Amino acid sequence: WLASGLDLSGHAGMLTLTSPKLVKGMAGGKYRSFLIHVKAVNESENLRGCDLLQEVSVTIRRFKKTSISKERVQRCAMLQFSEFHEKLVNTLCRKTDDGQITEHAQSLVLDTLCWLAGVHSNGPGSSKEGNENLLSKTRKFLSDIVRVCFFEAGRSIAHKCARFLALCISNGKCDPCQPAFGPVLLKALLDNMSFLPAATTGGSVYWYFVLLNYVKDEDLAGCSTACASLLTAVSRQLQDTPMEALLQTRYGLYSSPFDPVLFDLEMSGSEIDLSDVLEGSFTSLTGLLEVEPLHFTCVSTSDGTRIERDDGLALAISHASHFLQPPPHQSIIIERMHSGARRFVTLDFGRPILLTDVLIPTCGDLASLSIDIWTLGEEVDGRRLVVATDISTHSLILHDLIPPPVCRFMKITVIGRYGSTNARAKIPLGFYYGHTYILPWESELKNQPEIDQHLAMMVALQEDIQCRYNLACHRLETLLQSIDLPPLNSANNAQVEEDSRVFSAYQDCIQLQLQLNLAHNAVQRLKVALGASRKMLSETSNPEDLIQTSSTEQLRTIIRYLLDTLLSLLHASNGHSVPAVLQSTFHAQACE
C-alpha cells in the first residue's frame, strides 16, 4: 500500500521496490521487461485513489558489478541457504572463538544485515523460511546484539543497528504462529536498562531511547517501572561538592568545570524562562563528542552575495589544537532580494575530509536551500546531499550520514521566498561536523599518513589540553576562593569585574574541557581502529556499582533522556487512566 512509503508531511512519498524472487528469476537470465499496476482498493474534483496522485516519477537503479564472476549463485546462496544469517548473528554475539571481532567487522556485518532486511522487506508470495529463521535468530539473541550495538559501540554502529531493528519493525508481516517484533524487541530493550549508565556514546543511547519510545506502545508497565527504578537510583547517586553548587547559586553555571569527562554535546538551530510554561527538537543532533568540527574557507561567490563573520613540538601541538577548534559564527548577506533570489556559494575545507553531520539554522526569508559535495570536479564526482524547501518553517538538521562521505568542496545554492520584501537578512553557514583522520576503509569508498604517528600526535595533543584544562581548573579554583562568602544565607546571593573574570574563566574551562573530551573520544576511536575494544560490559557487573562508577555528565544526560521517555509515556495514555505501577513506586517519600 501507499502508507509504507509516505513522507513526514504526507503530501509526497517514495517506494524502493526489489525482491529476492526478482534476482532468483533473473538468475535464469531471461527477463527484460516489467509492468507496474496502480490500483485503488476500497472496503469540486472528487478524485478517488489513482486520480488523487498529482505528480509521478520513475527511476531504476542497477546493481554494482564487482570483480567476482558468477555472482548470481553467490547472491542466491544467502536467499536460499539461511545458515549465513545465524552466523552473522554469531558475529554480533562475540561467541565465536576465532579471535576478537573488531568494530569494522561489526559495521560490515551490520551493513549486510541491513541490506538483507531491505531485500526481505517485500517478499511476494515466496517461501519465508529463511526470513523466519533470521527473525528467530534475531529474537533469540536480541538482548546480546542490542547490548553490543547500543552500549559498546559508537554512533555509526548504533545508528545502523537502529536502522536494521526498525526495518525489522517495518516489515512485520508475520504468520499467526509467529509473534511480532514489537513485544520481543521491547523486552530486549528493557533487559538492558541496568547497563545503561555504563554505556560509551551519547548517540548510541539516543538511538536506543528513540527505539524504546517508539516500541513502548505495546507494553507499558515494564518500561514504566524500569524507568522509575533507574530514576530513583541515578537520582540518589547524582546527589553525591559545594563548588558547582556555589557556581549554580552565584552565576547559574550548571556544567561542572572540574569533571573532565562528558558524555555528548547536543546543539540545534531552533537557563530557561519559566513564565511561558507557567526545545523539543534540540535532541536532533546528539553525539557531537565523537566528531569534531571543521574550518571554512569561501572560494566562489555569486553576484550580490557576501560571506562575512558574525560578531618545536609545542608549536605543532598548538597548530593541531588550532585545527581542532570551533569556528566563530559566520553568515551570508545579500545585496538585492527578490522572489526567487538564486544565489550560490562555495566552501572549502582545505583537504579531503569525512563529513557526518550538518546544521543550518532557520532562515525565514529563504524558500529553499541545496547542498552539493565534490572532491575533484563539480561534474566529476558531484553527488547531491540534501535539498530542503521549508527553511522558513524549521531548521535543516542532517545527522550521522551512513555511509560517511568524503569531500573537499561544498556547494550551497539558495532560492529566496516568493514575494520577499527588499529588506536585508542573514543566512548563517551553520556548523559542519566531520572526521579529521580518514580511515582506510572509509577512504576506499570514494600522501595519507600512517595510523601510529597520528595516534601519537593525538595523544600528545590530549596530554597538552589536559595540562591546559588542569591549569584552567587551578586558576578557576584559586579565583573562586576569592568570592565573598557572606553569613547572609542566600538572599544576598540572588541579589562587576569579578563577575566578568569568573565568567571568562568558566568559559575557558568549559572550552578546554570540551576539547579534551572530544580529543579523548578521537584517540579512543583511533585505538579501536587499531584493533582494540572499549569497556566490556561483564556479566558479573553489579548494576549499582556501574551506577556509582559512572560520570556525572553521563548521569545527567541519561536522567534527562529517560525522564523524557517518562513524559512521553505519560502522554501516551491519551488522557485515560495512568497505570498503577508508576503511580505506586512514586509515593510521597519517593517524590520528595
Binding site: 513564565s275 538572599a491 540572588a494 541579589q495
Partner: protein, 39 residues
C-alpha cells in the same frame, strides 16, 4: 521603606520611567481624531 529581598526576587519575574505608551487614552467629547498619537 528600603527594598528587601522580596523586591529583588520579584523585580525580574515580570531612574524614572515613562508609562504613557502602556496606557490608553480617551476623551469625554467626540474629537475628529483619537489622542493615542500623544502616548
Amino acid at each position: 521603606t528600603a527594598r528587601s529581598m522580596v523586591s529583588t526576587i520579584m523585580k525580574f519575574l515580570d531612574g524614572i520611567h515613562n508609562f504613557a505608551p502602556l496606557g490608553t487614552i480617551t476623551s469625554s467629547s467626540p474629537t475628529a481624531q483619537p489622542a493615542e498619537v500623544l502616548l
